[PDB]
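look at this record:
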Amino acid sequence: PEEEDHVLVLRRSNFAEALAAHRYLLVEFYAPWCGHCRALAPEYARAAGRLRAEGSEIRLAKVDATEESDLAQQYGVRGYPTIKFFRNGDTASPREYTAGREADDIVNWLRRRTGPAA
């Protein structure tokens, strides 16, 4: 599927397949006009590049919730950005990401969910 600076581009048609392929999957629901999403996009992409540089199986993804609204409403998204971590493809119980928005604290937070060499 599409990938912008190593961040997977997800929509309803490929969302279930990404969960099945990636057991550690961070998903950012965003709006391109939202200022905090704009400030987040370079840091999110730098976090994904570093994980890719580290040979990690963790994957970062993003969903334009203004264009994929049913998918966003299915996960109770009521503001942007909304970041959720899915483990082992379990969509009922995603962990909410509420930590810093710099590249290093995203990967640190992901490492605390999985392990230093995941």
Observations:
- Residues 3-114 form a domain with the Glutaredoxin fold (CATH 3.40.30.10).
- The first strand starts at residue 3 and ends at 4.
